[PDB]
Design a protein around this ligand. Structure first.
Ligand SMILES: Cc1ncc(C[n+]2csc(CCOP(=O)(O)OP(=O)(O)O)c2C)c(N)n1
Ligand SMILES: Cc1ncc(C[n+]2csc(CCOP(=O)(O)OP(=O)(O)O)c2C)c(N)n1
Ligand SMILES: Cc1ncc(C[n+]2csc(CCOP(=O)(O)OP(=O)(O)O)c2C)c(N)n1
Ligand SMILES: [Mg+2]
Ligand SMILES: [Mg+2]
Ligand SMILES: [Mg+2]
Lengths: 530, 531, 531
């Protein structure tokens, strides 16, 4: 049979039957007579292609294939590829390559030294040494991506390989997708925890990926210790209305340290130590304290700022550790403050008020995605996430990921059949990076609701300039954008609301409309402290 | 505040990494200034030997050893042995001096240009610290990266001017795990497959040696009463070779290995690649109708296996968990391997099997055995049936020039542990040349290492390959005119050539009684057995 | 159709690249099968020597030489000498066998994993052909890439199964330029600066040697009547060293070089980096008030210069064009360098300047001189004043282990050209060890090479550095217990130790009369002059 026929059969066996792509000449032999039992999802630009695939893969917990056009396409996708790598998403990135007949002399659209282009943001990058190896290379790509710590891989595929007649090969294999902790280390860590007087827990997003939500609750309740979310936790690791939950840690060395004072043992599960952002002088952890870290990614433990670490799937660790820790009595761990109420009469509208209007009109069953940097602490006050697989944002800080990722997550809602609407809180600046993603939402009829907070500026960059005392930075203002027209351009239901009652009406309408909507909300240019 | 150097050496003390194997240069002198008396510096004359000595020592001690070499020039000379350290999974911390930051931008003589890219793809991590302040922390990250499973070498490029800088005293010391266990769901799945199988066959690889799973591998095999084979090119003995269940070492062609494992429905590979093939011999990966399970501690190995269902795990952790889920089987007439054959000792020129027999029958119970004499491997496997852990060592990579210096490192390890076994090293005459300078370190350190050189005046195994693969008239396969006795003398070793098996016995016993480095040259037949 | 092998060898004939220096392995046997009689295969015992021999030969012939080594293991052993070939700008075609495409995907033993990345950053191009059909074309692209200015090595990874494939007969042979000239606008600008200067000073580097610009450099200097200095660490003589205008070799510190060139308003550097510094010596790049012009054939060199206005050009092409635009100047009392000093020959232990004088006064008019004895360089520069092109050679990189085997390659070149000059090689005892195996190739090929080993039982220049840079108590600087005579004997060379200057004279004259490889060991004082 042909390389193509055999390869698609392998993909059926692996149950990887979705291809998100933006086509080109070098991909046509792969896509020829695309089979009806596979799904091809078009996006208009490659950053959106990857991010859509990422959102879908996160939802389904299995690989999705990306198919993009040689070097030019891979290049457009590199920002979102970095983000997929940091999200630990097992994407199989494929790009067509010029025909082996001409490759040596590098004609137009040759992906020159292809394997080196996506470095350092893939687990493996490869261009098969012959057509006969293509199916085997897909199996190796799957195997590589799916073993812990999961992540994206890249295959460069010469266009002439697909039509080659080869004898059937049986390359299908299976692999493990988790590894457990060294039992000596679990005992060591448990001894430390048992001996501590006032432990504090910091949970990160490995807990979300590994489906350890309930195990994380059991562990925290066993200790009756305060729980914080690690700084810049991309996915909710702990129920945010639980009495033990304190909030999300700030992201400066000194600021985080101040937040965790008063505890002798700092126990970090499923997170880097630590995902800092601004520079704030200080000590990593309080004087007199010590720290333990669990991550499923040897890279994270290898570069931690402090502590004793072990490498483990978060769920397997939490299960093992639970067996060794005895129940502790209530210890008046504080309860976080109730949500505040913003002035809804202020004009221009204040973002906390906007968030409150969305929240009070939301069904329990939504997916919430966020890429609106300046309002994050306000969102954290208002949307207290209390279910798993509900909140998603990037692990990387790379703008242009969330808009298309929301479409991918919505596609996942249809595959699972759960069909929650995906409510996506977007900054006006962030909205621009991968604005083309809206088209895929409309064409695929995904239920996605974009709420755009229009302050006509890159707000968080002004918050930074304030904190770090860097005045007169250019390019921070965004006058003259018509975001409603942006929604209209790609066929979304799109409107601007000028009052909170209009917002409630537009939002309820969007919740009732099985399709993609854009709701633009003008807000104050004023900014809270970073 | 203290100097970068003082803080770094204090970290190394805390980490218990206090041996540096090196070949010095100008860019390393600021690192080596006032080298402290509680550390050991081991000089070797060329950088391939530097890395291999460190590799051998690190394998012996099961902790990192520091390599200190001279910028890009030194790193370059070391790259073959670094590839081998990577495939051995040895947690070496490779350091090379770099030109001073005062000049780096304009790349004066002996700048290691794009230093982080030079050792790729053969390190787990490569780095040049962004400031002197980061040097101690970079050593900690280097240690952490190297010591987490799957273990392996890392590289730091260190500008010479950093060492004398006064920097804030920051505590960078951390600890890490060095093992990861299996997914319990996968252990259950694998145990179910094993329990249901009619006639399972076990293939053990060297993860078992590194992870100290020797006894657990025996327990597992005895629980199943299944035949055990060593994986092809297993660098370190994974199973006692005189155990009734042990069948031998698998050959390294696809079709040849397949034929050896026929008659078994389930193939269970623990601690090995699937598979470390070498010659091209067409066939099927496993017998028609069979299926395969694989356990490796290295996700790279499982990701590229030719066949099977795999999981990633430390070998010891897997064997312990799996034992819990499998029931004892009755003896099932698993065959016993043939006794060692007896070569014709009357034949001249001397035959290597007889040479090996003479060494074996005169060896003490406790030796370390190292081998890099490719054409005699099957003969060695017949004669030296290794029945203790941490006894046999060779390269994982096939890169000649590793074993001669690695033997010195293993010997240094015997002195550190205090066990003090002699290291007997079986060397081909061609192989001996690649890193011949390593002998000097053996002599200078007074390591008890005995090199037995099998002199057939040829690259024998390449002629074996030329036959199997039908490539006549290949040049450069003959090695006339080498005086290997003189090579030993050149570096100060006890050195002599023996012409009879009685002379060999006398020389070998003498070398065993001499606490130092010896070379015994044995002329053998140029005739070669089949691959 | 014909086999990939037949077509490739036919291309190599057309390109006139018919020498292969190699160390064979299984993955190269299909390439070397039925090696043709009109090509020459030169065996060396270790891959650092393989590359350096090829480098020396390629420098002699001014065309590529093929290196054939064994997958990642062989390439690894060669990386230090490959770095050096790159900095020498030698157009070597480095080839390594790769595992068969039948198994490559699953990476069996001796796979060169990510082969194209291993030799980075030390090749102009690295490639593994996408199919057997592309192999001949890949050799053509390899040749083209290597031979275009700035010349340098390239790497091909060649799967063993490609060679026997029948492929369409396609004509892939092409030709390329090997030189590029200067922007005429920049020549005019530079000429104007030179003409306007009051007291210009010339610094010449080794591009002049490679580009055969010897006479053009003399014409240019005589036109200006300006003092000429050799750039620091000039690997090959750029100007006749007994010419009245020649001042000497510049020192290699920023502040020391600056002091040497004081008193001149315009510094004109032709065919050199600006500058190849080594020790850190603080100061200004050029004297206050002066300005600098630079010509190099390598855009990398001009891109990273510490100072000046530069242009990229072949040295010969620039010198020819510039000569046209500059007027003759009158003699301006440019000083004449001091005559060679005369060392005390009565002193014992023997002093290296006296040893050098004895070699010089007994040397024939036509020799090739190679040097890798770091501590004696200034003494050599005083004694051996090179006054002919293509006579003196050393490394551009400072990587020890290059010169010993490179001497063999230079000797092979003397036989190819037919000129047959003896190659006299001045070696330190430490330096001698790195690639000692190279001697074997000299002996086996019967090259006329005379190694004079300066034995001070130490890494002398590292002690000089420890003094200048105040790093006491550095370990590994002493080299007791080496029998270098035995090293020569080991590889079949004429070998002896001399204890007096009269014995040295006798041994040296004998080696000059013996068409083969000799080693002469000369014990010298351990005392060391200042850097
Ligand atoms: C691809 C990419 N480009 C630039 C940035 C830098 N960046 C971080 S926040 C930010 C401004 C976001 O502005 P907006 O989306 O309008 O949200 P706001 O802060 O105003 O609420 C920018 C440009 C980035 N993180 N990623
Ligand atoms: C660094 C390196 N260069 C070349 C090879 C290829 N090679 C494999 S076996 C071999 C010959 C070994 O000869 P010898 O040590 O004399 O052993 P014999 O086969 O004669 O017993 C060679 C050159 C290699 N494996 N590694
Ligand atoms: C491959 C390599 N390793 C180490 C060095 C560092 N190095 C420079 S000079 C030198 C000593 C040379 O000693 P020797 O050849 O005996 O000459 P001497 O200085 O005693 O005259 C060393 C080890 C180097 N330049 N290249
Ligand atoms: Mg904004
Ligand atoms: Mg041999
Ligand atoms: Mg010396």
């Amino acid at each position: 049979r042909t390389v193509k026929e055999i390869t698609f059969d392998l993909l059926r066996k692996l149950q990887v039957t979705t291809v998100v792509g933006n086509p080109g000449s070098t991909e046509e032999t792969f896509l020829k007579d695309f089979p009806s039992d596979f799904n091809y999802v078009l996006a208009l630009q490659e950053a959106s292609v990857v991010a859509i695939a990422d959102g879908l893969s996160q939802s389904l917990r299995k690989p999705v294939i990306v198919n993009i056009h040689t070097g030019a396409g891979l290049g457009n996708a590199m920002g979102c590829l970095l983000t997929a790598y940091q999200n630990k998403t097992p994407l199989i990135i494929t790009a067509g390559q010029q025909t082996r007949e001409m490759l040596l002399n590098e004609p137009l659209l040759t992906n020159i030294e292809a394997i080196n282009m996506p470095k350092p943001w893939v687990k493996w990058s490869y261009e098969p040494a012959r057509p006969e190896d293509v199916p085997g290379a897909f199996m190796r790509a799957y195997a590589t991506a799916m073993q812990q710590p999961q992540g994206p891989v890249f295959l460069s595929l010469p266009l002439d390989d697909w039509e080659k007649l080869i004898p059937e090969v049986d390359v299908a294999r299976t692999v493990s997708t988790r590894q457990g902790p060294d039992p000596d280390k679990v005992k060591e860590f448990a001894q430390r925890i048992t001996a501590s007087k006032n432990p504090l827990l910091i949970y990160g997003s490995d807990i979300a990926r590994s489906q350890a939500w309930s195990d994380g609750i059991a562990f925290a309740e066993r200790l009756n210790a305060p729980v914080w979310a690690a700084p810049f936790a991309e996915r909710t690791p702990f129920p945010e209305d639980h009495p033990l939950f304190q909030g999300a840690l700030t992201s400066g060395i000194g600021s985080l340290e101040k937040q965790i004072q008063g505890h002798d043992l700092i126990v970090v599960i499923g997170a880097p130590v630590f995902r800092y952002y601004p520079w704030i002088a200080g000590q990593f952890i309080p004087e007199g304290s010590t720290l333990l870290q669990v991550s499923d990614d040897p890279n994270m433990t290898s570069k931690a700022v402090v502590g004793d670490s072990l490498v483990s799937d978060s769920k397997l660790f939490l299960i093992e550790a639970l067996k060794l820790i005895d129940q502790r009595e209530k210890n008046n761990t504080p309860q976080r403050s109730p949500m505040t109420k913003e002035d809804r009469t202020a004009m221009p509208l204040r973002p906390h008020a906007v968030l409150e209007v969305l929240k009070e009109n939301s069904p329990k069953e939504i997916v919430l995605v966020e890429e609106c940097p300046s309002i994050v602490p306000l969102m954290q006050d208002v949307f207290r996430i209390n279910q798993p697989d509900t909140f998603y944002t990037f692990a990387s800080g790379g703008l242009g990921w969330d808009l298309p990722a929301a479409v991918g997550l919505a596609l996942g809602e249809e595959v699972s059949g759960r069909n929650r609407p995906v409510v996506t809180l977007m900054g006006d600046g962030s909205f621009q990076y991968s604005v083309q993603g809206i088209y895929t939402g409309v064409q695929q009829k995904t239920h996605v609701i974009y709420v755009v907070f229009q302050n006509e500026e890159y707000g968080i960059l002004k918050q930074f300039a304030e904190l770090e005392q860097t005045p007169n930075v250019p390019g921070l203002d965004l006058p003259g954008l018509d975001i409603v027209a942006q929604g209209k351009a790609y066929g979304a239901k799109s409107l601007k609301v000028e009052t909170l009652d209009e917002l409630k009406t537009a939002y309820l309408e969007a919740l009732s409309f099985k399709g993609t909507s854009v709701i633009v909300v003008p807000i104050t240019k004023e900014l809270k402290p970073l």
